[PDB]
Structure formats: structure tokens, C-alpha cells
Amino acid sequence: HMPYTIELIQPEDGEAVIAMLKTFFFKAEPLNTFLDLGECKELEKYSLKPLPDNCSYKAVNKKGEIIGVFLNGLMRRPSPDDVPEKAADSCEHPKFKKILSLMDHVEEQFNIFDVYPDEELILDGKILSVDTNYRGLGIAGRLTERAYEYMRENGINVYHVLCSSHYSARVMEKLGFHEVFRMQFADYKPQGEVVFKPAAPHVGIQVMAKEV
Numbered sequence: 001h002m003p004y005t006i007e008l009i010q011p012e013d014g015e016a017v018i019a020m021l022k023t024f025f026f027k028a029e030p031l032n033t034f035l036d037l038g039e040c041k042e043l044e045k046y047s048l049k050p051l052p053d054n055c056s057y058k059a060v061n062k063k064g065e066i067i068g069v070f071l072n073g074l075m076r077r078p079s080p081d082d083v084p085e086k087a088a089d090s091c092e093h094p095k096f097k098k099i100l101s102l103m104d105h106v107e108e109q110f111n112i113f114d115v116y117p118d119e120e121l122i123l124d125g126k127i128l129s130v131d132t133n134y135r136g137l138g139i140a141g142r143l144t145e146r147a148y149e150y151m152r153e154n155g156i157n158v159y160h161v162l163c164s165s166h167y168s169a170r171v172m173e174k175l176g177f178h179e180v181f182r183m184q185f186a187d188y189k190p191q192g193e194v195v196f197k198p199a200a201p202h203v204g205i206q207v208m209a210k211e212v
């Protein structure tokens with residue numbers, strides 16, 4: 001029950017975070033749904049990568065249950081010659097590899113520091129999820145406000161969130177973000193042919209940003 005606390009997520013919390021995301025987050029993602037992604041250990045491992053950056057937050061109720069998370073990573077301004085490690089490289093899951101390959105392609109097509117060339121460090125919002133028993137109560141907004149406190153404490157001015165869902169992008173707009181980059185699924189043809197055709201409201205990847 002409530003009030004809930006908002007706390008820093010520790011690496012120890014990884015199993016509990018994954019359990020929560022399986023019930024409330026992963027199955028709602030449109031690319032996951034389009035591919036009919038089953039149980040996917042690679043997705044779970046990839047989802048936990050931001051935690052050691054020590055800027056991910058959990059909402060925890062009076063029973064000690066995680067009822068919301070906002071997983072965040074830190075993004076440092078790249079040098080022109082830096083090449084990012086391809087996430088899809090060495091992925092063993094063929095369906096999930098297609099998703100990571102698209103993520104790598106977005107990274108090659110758009111650099112957030114082209115929008116913000118004077119910024120040295122940007123906060124990267126990766127996964128925002130709230131328990132379906134506790135939605136409409138402002139938990140997402142308070143998780144986001146906790147990240148604003150991290151940003152103020154550390155001199156970070158820009159919050160970046162990549163969305164694969166039209167509905168996710170609108171949630172971020174309601175939270176005060178704006179779109180800075182779009183790539184339509186209909187235009188993503190890495191080997192000459194379309195790979196993704198999710199349900200109609202989902203037109204493409206939308207990168208959202210907020211100056212805070």
C-alpha cells in the first residue's frame with residue numbers, strides 16, 4: 001500500500017526489476033509484439049545495463065514491492081572518431097537481434113549531441129514502467145522528477161529518451177519533452193526491404209528530449 005518511497009536502484013535489485021518489467025513493460029513494446037518475442041534472456045540482460053550508472057530510480061510500496069522504475073544511463077559527448085560498440089554484435093537471439101540492429105542504426109543516423117553540441121553529459125532515459133495496479137497516480141512523474149534532481153545535482157541540462165512506441169512518445173510529451181528525431185519503420189530497409197511493420201499508430205522511432 002502507499003505512500004511509496006522513491007529510491008536508487010542497486011545492482012542487487014536486478015532480479016526484482018526484471019520480474020516487474022516482464023509483467024508490466026516488455027510485452028507492451030510494439031517491436032516485441034510485432035516480432036512475437038517470447039521469453040528473451042538477452043532482452044533482460046540488455047535492460048539491466050544502465051543500473052551501475054547510479055541514476056536509476058524505483059518506486060517501492062509499503063510491502064516492499066517495486067511498483068515503478070525509471071532506468072537511466074549517462075551519455076557522454078562522443079568524439080568524432082569514436083565508434084560505439086554495436087549492441088546487436090554477438091546477440092544470440094535472432095528476433096531480439098533485429099531490434100538491437102535497428103537501435104544501432106538509429107545511433108548511426110542521429111547523435112543527440114548534434115542537437116546539443118555544447119553539452120558534455122546528457123541523461124538517457126531507457127525504461128519507464130509503472131505497475132498496472134498503480135497507474136494514473138503520478139508515479140511516472142515523480143520518478144521523472146527524481147531524475148531532475150540528479151540532473152541539478154550534477155550539472156546536466158538535457159534529458160534524452162528514445163521511444164519505439166507512439167504512445168510512449170506521447171507520455172513523454174505530457175511530461176514536458178519534445179521530439180528531436182524520427183525514423184519511420186516504413187523507411188528502415190537495411191538490406192533493401194522493410195523489417196518492421198508494427199500496428200498503425202506506431203510509425204517509427206521517436207527520440208524525445210527535454211531541457212531542464
Ligand SMILES: CC(=O)SCCNC(=O)CCNC(=O)[C@H](O)C(C)(C)COP(=O)(O)OP(=O)(O)OC[C@H]1O[C@@H](n2cnc3c(N)ncnc32)[C@H](O)[C@@H]1OP(=O)(O)O
Pocket residue numbers: 024025028125126127128129130131132134135136137138139140141161162163167168169171172174
Ligand atoms: C522511456 C519510456 O519507456 S517512455 C515511458 C513509457 N512506458 C510505457 O509505455 C510502459 C507502459 N505504461 C506504463 O508503464 C505507464 O502507463 C506509464 C509509465 C506510461 C505512466 O505511468 P503513470 O504513473 O500511470 O503516469 P500518470 O499517472 O502520469 O498517468 C499517465 C496517463 O496514463 C493514463 N492512464 C490511466 N490509467 C492507465 C493504465 N491502466 N494504463 C495506461 N495508462 C493509463 C492516465 O489517464 C494519464 O493520462 P494523462 O497523462 O492524460 O493525465
